[PDB]
Design a protein around this ligand. Structure first.
Ligand SMILES: OC[C@@H]1[C@@H](O)[C@H](O)[C@@H](O)c2[nH]cc[n+]21
Ligand SMILES: [Zn+2]
Length: 1016
């Protein structure tokens, strides 16, 4: 039934880890094709009965923000490109154009008059204007979470289906900085049949070109049977621009970019300008161009050749449309009429190219190789590896993950009901999805935009968060209020969200204190939401104005709680120390919330005049020389002081953690009986080269291995409680915190790199795990891929994206670090893991940004650290390219990315309040998630429709006996189901009408989408 994703090593022609191990990577001068070789072809290959079919595909790369904001580019460039494309395509029926970025197309098309909308639909319908991919953006593939790649894809394709009546099945990704197999995974489950990529390491292009393996069936690394495969075309040369798309010699190809003759302020760096095609030169020019084409064709297996014709923000001026079109028309007329070339050349679209390739394949002209793996880390030349952007602008990388979860929660919470249009739910959700989708752009989450553009993205995401909160709190008020009492004002704020980790302590004082007092308000309701489809317990904390607070559930059952002080860290410019201060006006209360699957649970906080029975108080110990007092208002336990010393802590029956006198982990003991396993946290710094190429937002070019941060004698704060303990230390640039709640610790770093120029701060873990040169990192939060550190590559090439986690292991032991934000990282030596925290760079790195990275701001990075025994786990064989998390590590990742949401009732009395929502929801097996729940219909639809994306991961089997769990049938989550359909992941096509209206669960590592229809 399900394929085994662990025990069967797929047989593929190209496996990228294996290729990397055998490949040389030497950077030799290949001639005019600087990174290749002098291509030779047999003139007799093509003849009257076997012609080269050439598709020249005009395109325009439109960054939705980069050096200018989205709106700046729309006004200065893109609106003119699309307006002129409409006119020129309309007037020139054989001309063609492809378009990828639906954010801009939707921005344009809603400003069009109906006349022009009709003209636009007609050039789309007749095939002249073709959408490729059709996502909101062309997303980053390194840092983006798969859920947000799907979100943006769905945003763009839903728009296209509604307004243009088309759904692309060919993808175009010419600019992400390296490529991930998460894309063919999502695309193939979204109806796609073909995809194109460009930015892969120059050594890989050379190696695959030599074997004519640039077109391949790209399957997932665990996929033995190949049902995930998607036909992929990799472009062979250094750029998607015209000099690097006609053939191997850019000095020749630049002469066929007719925008470079001078009046457009562009030129050919190879010093030979384009010449206008005329009758007198067209034979000569045609000979030059066809020779480039036939050389490019030698790198591919069919007689169908793709020639992209475009560059950034091209096809803007009317004169530009004319100069490209007319000159190419003159070339085509001559070439196609001269039999000796045995070429038929024409403007085409991407789908036309792929259709002809597969016609050639079906006619037995070619068979394509199979490939698995990824295309990280990219280098475009020499040792210039693009691993910098795995970390650049980490504040916004973390914000991406926060907004990711708020969008899911807002869509899910509001999906349970139909809402009147006056509630503006659909409007607020559309804004939130679109701002998050825009940020998936390969200059958004990547941290490669200009400072003012990063500010625009942040402002947009802030508005999106506000939109999510609004939707979420209205939905909680409706879900938990007795129906005949529910009396909404859709503008009102019934609850506010409390988020302990965003923007996070010492990032902003954006947390509300619940103010209670005998003379004002005795108690407060709080509500937790659990977006995950299983019952979940999680400690939650709130700020309260008294330490004397007790917690009850909504059967008035006491709930055990712990109160701790509110500590904030300060750089004391007087004492020249980083040290904590305790609030004397507010306190933290912590308790375990238990919440139904996809549900809500209400608790009550009540003040009392003295210590409540079921509330305990943490002790606090400040370790530093020369201490001074730390009063804590009414907090009942006095702070203790001591000189720095090693300390050990244990919460519950969980691990025992030992810390150095500088407050950093040194060992973990899993059980009373077990060994203290060395696990040492260390902070180090990388610098920048004084000679040669400089690191910048894209590139990581360290001046050698990292050097330890000089820590001096830092102040360490130990808080010990029954429910939660922690060790926090004020290091230079980092307030580092280890938090213990009874299982794997949580690490929080408040990272403020300040004015440390040309510095990259890394967090490293040092262990005795005999990992050798192997480690594992995830791709887009979806899968873990085996990495091998290669000493034939420089340090920065051994850096990979860490979008959600990484691990190392040996036969017996594994250490897994889960992240709440994408960052760059590696294992640079056996037993080590490391992950970059922030980077501040004074210089530009020659990739077009025209600035360094000097706009850092404090960011709270969050992690879970899971040390496990794995000798009993059933793991893949040594040759398998994948790895898989354990249950504990997967749950720890979920605790970071989709924590409980916390709501505080905003007024004094909630009348009609209810205790729980969702208690009858099925509690699904732990490896299954409802990644998306989205109502797809507005309230006036007679047939309501709700879409669900179901993802099952694959967890390692390590001998924990399985317990029965309930089957989750998403189609019966809402009443009056009238139909259940399996759909593509965008919900845009029905694939199966399901028996009994039951949505089956999915196999490990698969993702499916279902839509339930309900009579209303
Ligand atoms: O070098 C990479 C940068 C990218 O950041 C932009 O997305 C891309 O469109 C572009 N054009 C020129 C230079 N660049
Ligand atoms: Zn771009």
């Amino acid at each position: 039934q399900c394929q085994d994703v662990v025990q069967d090593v797929p047989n593929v022609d190209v496996q990228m880890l294996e290729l990397y191990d055998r490949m040389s990577f030497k950077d030799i001068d290949g001639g005019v094709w600087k990174q290749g070789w002098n291509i030779k072809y047999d003139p007799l290959k093509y003849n009257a009965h076997h012609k080269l079919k050439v598709f020249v595909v005009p395109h325009s790369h439109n960054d939705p923000g980069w050096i200018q904001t989205f709106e700046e580019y729309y006004q200065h460039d893109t609106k003119h490109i699309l307006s002129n494309a409409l006119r020129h395509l309309h007037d020139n029926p054989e001309m063609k154009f492809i378009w990828a970025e639906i954010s801009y197309f939707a921005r344009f098309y809603h400003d069009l008059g109906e006349n022009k909308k009709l003209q636009m639909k007609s050039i789309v319908k007749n095939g002249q204007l073709e959408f490729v991919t059709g996502g909101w953006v062309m997303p980053d593939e390194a840092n983006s979470h798969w859920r947000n790649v799907l979100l943006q894809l769905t945003e763009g394709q839903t728009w296209l289906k509604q307004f243009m009546n088309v759904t692309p099945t060919a993808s175009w990704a010419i600019d992400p900085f390296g490529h991930s197999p998460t894309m063919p995974y999502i695309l193939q489950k979204s109806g796609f049949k073909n995809m194109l990529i460009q930015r892969t390491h120059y050594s890989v292009k050379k190696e695959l070109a030599q074997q004519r393996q640039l077109e391949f069936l790209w399957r997932q690394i665990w996929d033995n049977k190949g049902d995930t495969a998607l036909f992929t075309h990799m472009m062979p040369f250094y750029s998607y621009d015209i000099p690097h798309t006609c053939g191997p010699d850019p000095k020749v190809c630049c002469q066929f970019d007719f925008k470079r003759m001078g009046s457009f302020g562009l030129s050919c760096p190879w010093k030979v300008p384009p010449r206008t095609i005329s009758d007198q030169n067209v034979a000569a020019r045609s000979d030059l161009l066809v020779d480039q084409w036939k050389k490019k064709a030698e790198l591919y297996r069919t007689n169908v050749l793709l020639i992209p014709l475009g560059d950034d923000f091209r096809f803007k001026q009317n004169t530009e449309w004319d100069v490209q079109r007319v000159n190419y028309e003159r070339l085509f007329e001559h070439i196609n009429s001269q039999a000796h070339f045995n070429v038929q050349a024409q403007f085409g679209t991407l789908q036309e190219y792929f259709d002809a390739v597969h016609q050639a394949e079906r006619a037995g002209q070619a068979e394509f190789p199979t490939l698995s793996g990824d295309f990280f880390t990219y280098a475009d030349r020499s040792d210039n590896y693009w691993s910098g952007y795995y970390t650049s602008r980490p504040y916004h990388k973390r914000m991406d993950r926060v907004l990711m979860h708020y969008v899911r929660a807002a869509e899910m919470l509001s999906a349970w009901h139909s809402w009147d249009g006056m509630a503006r739910i659909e409007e607020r959700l559309e804004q939130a999805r679109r701002e998050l989708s825009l940020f998936q752009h390969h200059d958004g989450i990547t941290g490669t935009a200009k400072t003012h553009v990063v500010v625009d993205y942040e402002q947009r995401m802030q508005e999106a968060l506000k939109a999510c909160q609004m939707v979420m709190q209205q939905s909680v008020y409706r879900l938990l209020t007795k129906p005949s009492i529910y009396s909404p004002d859709f503008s009102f704020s019934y609850f506010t969200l409390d988020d302990s980790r965003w923007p996070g302590s010492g990032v902003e004082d954006s947390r509300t204190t619940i103010i209670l007092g005998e003379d004002i308000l005795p108690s407060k309701h709080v509500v937790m939401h659990n977006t995950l489809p299983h019952w979940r317990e999680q400690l939650v904390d709130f700020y309260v104005s008294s330490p004397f607070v007790s917690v009850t559930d909504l059967a008035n059952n006491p709930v055990e709680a712990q109160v701790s002080p509110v500590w904030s860290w300060h750089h004391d410019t007087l004492t020249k120390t980083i040290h904590p201060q305790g609030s004397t006006t507010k306190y933290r209360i912590i308790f375990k919330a238990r919440v139904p699957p996809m549900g809500l649970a209400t608790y009550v906080l009540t003040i009392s005049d003295s210590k409540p029975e079921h509330t305990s108080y943490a002790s606090n110990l400040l370790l530093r020389k020369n201490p001074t007092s730390l009063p804590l208002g009414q907090y009942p336990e006095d702070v203790k002081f001591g000189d720095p010393r090693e300390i050990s802590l244990r919460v519950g029956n969980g691990p025992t953690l030992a810390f150095s006198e500088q407050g950093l982990l040194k060992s973990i003991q899993l059980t009373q009986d077990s060994p203290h396993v060395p696990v040492h946290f260390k902070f180090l710094k990388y610098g920048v080269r004084s000679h040669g190429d400089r690191s910048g937002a894209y590139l990581f070019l360290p001046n050698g291995p990292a050097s330890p941060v000089e820590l001096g004698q830092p102040v360490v704060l130990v808080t010990k409680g029954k429910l939660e303990s922690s060790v926090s230390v004020g290091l230079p640039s980092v307030v580092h915190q280890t938090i213990m709640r009874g299982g794997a610790p949580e690490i929080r770093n408040l990272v403020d790199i300040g004015s440390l120029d040309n510095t990259e701060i890394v967090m490293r873990l040092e262990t005795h795990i005999d990992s050798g040169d192997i480690f594992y990192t995830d791709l887009n939060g979806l899968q873990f891929i085996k990495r091998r550190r290669l000493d034939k590559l420089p340090l920065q090439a051994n850096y990979y994206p860490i979008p959600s986690g990484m691990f190392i292991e040996d036969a017996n032991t594994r250490l897994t670090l889960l992240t709440g934000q994408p960052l760059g990282g590696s294992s640079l030596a056996s037993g080590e893991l490391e992950i970059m925290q922030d980077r501040r760079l004074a210089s530009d790195d020659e990739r077009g940004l025209g600035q360094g990275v000097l706009d850092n701001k404090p960011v709270l990075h969050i992690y879970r650290l899971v040390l496990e025994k794995v000798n009993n786990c059933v793991r893949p064989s040594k040759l398998h390219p994948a790895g898989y998390l354990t249950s504990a590590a997967h749950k720890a990742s979920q605790s970071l990315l989709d924590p409980l949401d916390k709501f505080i009732f905003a007024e004094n009395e909630w009348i009609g309040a209810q205790g729980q929502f969702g208690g009858d929801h099925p509690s699904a097996r732990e490896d299954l998630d409802v990644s998306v729940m989205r109502r797809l219909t507005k309230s006036s639809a007679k047939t309501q429709r709700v879409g669900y994306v179901l993802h099952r991961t694959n967890l390692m089997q390590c001998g924990t006996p399985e317990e029965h769990t309930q089957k989750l049938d998403v189609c019966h989550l809402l009443p009056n189901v009238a139909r259940c359909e399996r759909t593509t992941l965008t919900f845009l096509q029905n694939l199966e009408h399901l028996d009994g209206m039951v949505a089956p669960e999915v196999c490990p590592m698969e993702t499916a989408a279902y839509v339930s229809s309900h009579s209303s």
